[PDB]
Amino acid sequence: MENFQKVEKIGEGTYGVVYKARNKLTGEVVALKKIRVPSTAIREISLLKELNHPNIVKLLDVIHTENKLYLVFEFLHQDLKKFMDASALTGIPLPLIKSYLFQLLQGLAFCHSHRVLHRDLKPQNLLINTEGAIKLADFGLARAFVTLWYRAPEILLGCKYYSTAVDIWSLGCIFAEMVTRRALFPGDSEIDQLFRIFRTLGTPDEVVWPGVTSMPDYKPSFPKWARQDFSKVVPPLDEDGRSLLSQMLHYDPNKRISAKAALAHPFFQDVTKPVPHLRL
Numbered sequence: 001m002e003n004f005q006k007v008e009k010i011g012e013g014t015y016g017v018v019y020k021a022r023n024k025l026t027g028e029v030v031a032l033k034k035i036r037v038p039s040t041a042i043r044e045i046s047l048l049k050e051l052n053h054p055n056i057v058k059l060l061d062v063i064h065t066e067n068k069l070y071l072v073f074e075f076l077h078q079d080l081k082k083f084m085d086a087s088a089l090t091g092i093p094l095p096l097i098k099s100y101l102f103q104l105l106q107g108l109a110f111c112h113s114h115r116v117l118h119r120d121l122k123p124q125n126l127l128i129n130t131e132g133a134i135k136l137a138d139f140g141l142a143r144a145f146v147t148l149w150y151r152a153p154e155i156l157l158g159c160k161y162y163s164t165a166v167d168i169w170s171l172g173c174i175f176a177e178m179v180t181r182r183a184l185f186p187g188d189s190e191i192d193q194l195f196r197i198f199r200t201l202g203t204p205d206e207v208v209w210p211g212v213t214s215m216p217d218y219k220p221s222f223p224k225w226a227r228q229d230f231s232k233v234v235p236p237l238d239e240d241g242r243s244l245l246s247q248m249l250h251y252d253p254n255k256r257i258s259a260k261a262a263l264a265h266p267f268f269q270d271v272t273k274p275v276p277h278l279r280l
């Protein structure tokens with residue numbers, strides 16, 4: 001819009017291009033998102049404008065002008081993906097990884113309690129500040145209105161009425177990635193994605209996942225793989241970390257751990273809030 005000096009295109013995703021912009025009037029630097037108009041989209045958004053939390057990127061303003069929608073968000077200095085790319089030679093220390101996951105579970109727990117799902121978590125929409133805080137960006141736009149890597153298996157198998165459990169799956173995937181410095185399931189197609197999950201956690205069945213064989217995209221023709229030990233999957237992570245991850249990656253959406261429950265896991269017993277050395 002004309003109230004902003006679009007100083008840069010910091011990115012672009014499923015819902016449009018995001019720009020680092022300065023408010024011509026307030027002088028503040030904000031993240032301007034040009035959304036790519038449904039009275040309902042508008043109404044879902046208004047709800048999001050009102051959901052505030054320390055671990056959720058704040059939606060400052062909604063500009064519905066000339067039948068166009070722009071979302072104005074607070075600006076954060078870096079995203080997790082870039083930060084991990086910088087740390088790839090030494091990894092993000094466990095204390096920082098632990099603090100980040102803890103904060104992320106709090107954000108998720110706040111949203112999930114309001115029946116708000118993200119549905120598209122990935123390192124790129126996790127933003128961090130020099131203060132050691134991390135926040136979830138784009139929360140709830142999915143309902144208001146492409147890497148398959150963090151996609152929950154029930155979504156891959158055709159489930160249309162998915163739950164908050166899809167976010168815990170995504171988070172578990174990210175958690176593993178920070179630990180090993182390599183993506184857990186780097187799938188290049190929905191079926192490749194699905195068989196990558198199967199080769200590591202083993203092909204699901206009625207025992208571990210009752211109802212699985214009746215899923216829409218489920219085919220009796222799927223290969224049967226065996227489950228690998230987690231010690232081999234996330235070699236560096238301790239027992240507490242592995243049991244937590246295990247619970248986040250349960251096939252059955254109803255058996256997969258909740259964000260609130262995860263906060264009480266013994267893995268977070270020695271959590272602290274260290275500060276990251278960011279290069280801006």
Ligand SMILES: Cn1cnc2c(NCc3ccccc3)nc(NCCO)nc21
Binds near residue numbers: 018057075078124
């Ligand atoms: C809604 N929002 C608030 N701050 C940011 C931010 N800040 C990080 C940032 C700063 C400068 C250049 C690139 C990214 N990055 C992005 N998208 C980046 C994911 O590719 N959106 C943001």
